[PDB]
UniProtKB/Swiss-Prot annotation, chains A, B:
The keyword DNA-binding applies. GO terms for molecular function: DNA binding; DNA-binding transcription factor activity. Signal peptide: none annotated. Keywords: DNA-binding, Transcription, Transcription regulation, Virulence. The lineage of its organism: Bacteria, Pseudomonadati, Pseudomonadota, Gammaproteobacteria, Enterobacterales. InterPro entries: HTH_MarR-typ (IPR000835), Tscrpt_reg_MarR-type_CS (IPR023187), WH-like_DNA-bd_sf (IPR036388), WH_DNA-bd_sf (IPR036390). The keyword Transcription regulation applies. This is Transcriptional regulator HosA. PANTHER family: TRANSCRIPTIONAL REGULATOR, MARR (PTHR42756), TRANSCRIPTIONAL REPRESSOR OF EMRAB OPERON (PTHR42756:SF1). Residues 1-131 form the HTH marR-type domain. The gene is hosA. Involved in the temperature-dependent positive control of flagellum-driven swimming motility and cellular aggregation. Regulates fliC expression by directly interacting with fliC promoter.
Length: 131, 131
């Protein structure tokens, strides 16, 4: 179709499908969460919605499953047990470190068909469409 | 993040969220299916996976729910009851015709921040990354 956002879902689904084959137990939302926890340990669970793209509900179920698999650990505010702080466990660290090159490689199967200038320009368009 | 595909999911989720508010009972996959049935009535259910971006399973559940709401109707091959042909009902026609301007409008909140040349160029990048 000639619809930009239809072709967008085409590209996004192909990337997701390749991601699923390569990382069957770590989806892109789960991977992004873990990336965001690594470069900000103790990040607030609420601040992790922007840093990972999600809703409060989806992040809650995600973090529960990751907590259930020993990938992350969480601590609460003593004054407001609603707010939570999230860290990556040593097991989660190992999972994340191994997944980064695989994710980069899945990105590269698509980004690699673009020049560095084209990749940068794709990024400025996507950012201009958001802000 | 500086990751093109992370920002892609950012843009795609914002568009989906606005789509959900405007068309709560017609998701983008459901809308794309209906568009593809309109300009090819009697299309084979299997051929509707490409024309709508989906898996066989997701399309089956989608078409069942749409059939259950009288939006589409289906006929089978007499020699192979597995294969199905899909049409839009008159009620589905009305739903589709009303949804097209709303969808275009949701697309426009993002595409409108781009010049015609920028929109065309975003499309060539997305297509170059797929083929």
């Amino acid at each position: 179709r000639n619809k930009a956002f239809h072709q967008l879902r085409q590209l996004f689904q192909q990337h997701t499908a390749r991601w699923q084959h390569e990382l069957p137990d770590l989806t892109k939302p789960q991977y992004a969460v873990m990336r965001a926890i690594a470069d900000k340990p103790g990040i607030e669970q609420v601040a992790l919605i922007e840093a990972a793209v999600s809703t409060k509900a989806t992040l809650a179920e995600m973090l529960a499953r990751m907590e259930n698999r020993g990938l992350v650990r969480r601590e609460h505010d003593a004054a407001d047990k609603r707010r939570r702080f999230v860290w990556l466990t040593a097991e989660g660290e190992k999972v994340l470190a191994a997944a980064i090159p695989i994710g980069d490689s899945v990105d590269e199967e698509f980004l690699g068909r673009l020049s560095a200038e084209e990749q940068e320009l794709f990024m400025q368009l996507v950012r201009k469409m958001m802000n």
